[PDB]
Amino acid sequence: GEIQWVKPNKETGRLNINGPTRTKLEPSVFHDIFEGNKEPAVLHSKDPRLEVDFEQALFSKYVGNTLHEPDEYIKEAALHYANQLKQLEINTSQMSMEEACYGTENLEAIDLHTSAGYPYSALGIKKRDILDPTTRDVSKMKFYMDKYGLDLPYSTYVKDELRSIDKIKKGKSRLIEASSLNDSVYLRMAFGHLYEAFHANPGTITGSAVGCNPDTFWSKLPILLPGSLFAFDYSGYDASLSPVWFRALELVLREIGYSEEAVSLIEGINHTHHVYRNKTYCVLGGMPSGCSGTSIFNSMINNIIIRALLIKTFKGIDLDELNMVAYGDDVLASYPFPIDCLELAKTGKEYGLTMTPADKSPCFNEVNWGNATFLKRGFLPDEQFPFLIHPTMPMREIHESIRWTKDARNTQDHVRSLCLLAWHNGKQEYEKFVSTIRSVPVGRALAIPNYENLRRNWLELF
RNA sequence: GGGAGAUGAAAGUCUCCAGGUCUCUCGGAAA
RNA sequence: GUUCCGAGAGA
Ligand SMILES: [Mg+2]
Ligand SMILES: [Mg+2]
Ligand SMILES: [Mg+2]
Ligand SMILES: [Mg+2]
Ligand SMILES: [Mg+2]
Ligand SMILES: [Zn+2]
């Protein structure tokens, strides 16, 4: 992705977009009894913790574009993935506006708790002023789609979240690209049934984990990914995508049966205009992080990428033997023979992708089930039933979360949620976590789930 | 580095408004 | 399993 130009809003006529410049995260009652390094991300260009220029850091992710047109390898990769998807029998017809707005069994309703985006937010119109779940009314939606149309600019915001202290000093906060409600509705109408099919089928047919529940899906991953496991990380995946990968995604949608009119909507994701503060800018390439379908389209593109890298790098690859599961840029994959991911990473560079060893390990090709992660979780066989695999969120990550809060009233729910992540690490580690929680009065008053009950409920899921 | 307010001589400080797409999970209430 | 409300995690 690459910024094509930047203009003042006084030139384009767009409304200014401003979001919170102070964090909602504060130290919790556990802040001092657990260790941690993370703090709230920089939200303001004058944050005294910065050691670099803020806005230069924010937009450095737009590293540029390489290819714009699929080569033979990307074409062959796209068709291979498309052929694999045909067994899902995705319904390519338009989803009704009522279903796109108010949801289905496998597609959640539009989130009425978040911004309606451009221009509604700058005009004080909320999603709930347009959508009503008690009536499932679509007349007001159609009125505002006629009034304001489609392909509205994305509204750029800085995400309020914990970041490592080195990302604080380097100004590496993450940007949110808020979709206009009009475009979320329109993409959901075009692709809503594909969303449903992916959500209902996490695994190696979609090549996607969207919709998975790690508590049970982890035991499936070694069965879905047999053979020689491999994995790697991307640096700035979303913004590094060149237009070629959107053309590749179009090839996939066309091949599985979408009309040209539906396929053409992807150009409105490849090419987007954005408003940040008082400026409008044009971005060619790059997945806009807050568009409808971000995680699925990122996951589909990852399936195309790895296929293309394999057949461009190595001779005699049989893509039918590739197994992979992506969640956006995150991935785990396998193949019947070990493959040299350093060589794959070199090919990735030609395509404008920056691939690095999985989980900041020093070199490629040392991934195994004992050290693999996915969705920040490791894989730990149960001691009694080794065919059942615990997802292990590292305790260090759970400690970072417990040290901050948006509201001390949330402490009971927050801690219980972390307990359901922590106990997979084992009885000893869980009891140490619970003991530290109970060393202050607020924690000693909480209801904390019992390890043996947690594990017994987990075993019953199978 | 926005809007409105409070306080203040100001610098500041403080309150509310303003902050995506999705998935999974827990909790409260309800039929 | 459903609905509304609140929360946590992940991409
Ligand atoms: Mg499902
Ligand atoms: Mg990973
Ligand atoms: Mg301000
Ligand atoms: Mg608000
Ligand atoms: Mg519930
Ligand atoms: Zn443009």
Residue numbers in the entry: 1 to 462
Quoted passage from the original study:
The 3D (also known as 3Dpol) protein is an RNA-dependent RNA polymerase (RdRP) that plays the central role in viral RNA genome replication, and has become a major target for antiviral studies.
The crystal structure was solved at 1.8 Å resolution in space group C2 by molecular replacement using previously reported genotype-B EV71 RdRP EC structure as the search model. The final model had Rwork and Rfree values of 0.181 and 0.214, respectively, and the crystallographic asymmetric unit contained only one EC. The RdRP in this EC is structurally consistent with RdRPs in the previously reported enterovirus EC structures with the root-mean-square deviation (RMSD) values in the range of 0.5–1.1 Å for all superimposable α-carbon atoms (the new structure as the reference; 99–100% coverage). Interestingly, the guanine moiety of the 5′-end guanosine of the downstream RNA was observed to interact with a fingers domain pocket, with its guanine plane sandwiched by the imidazole moiety of the index finger residue H44 and the guanidinium moiety of the middle finger residue R277 likely through stacking interactions (average distances to the guanine plane: 3.4 Å and 3.6 Å for guanidinium and imidazole moieties, respectively; angles between neighboring planes: 10–15°).
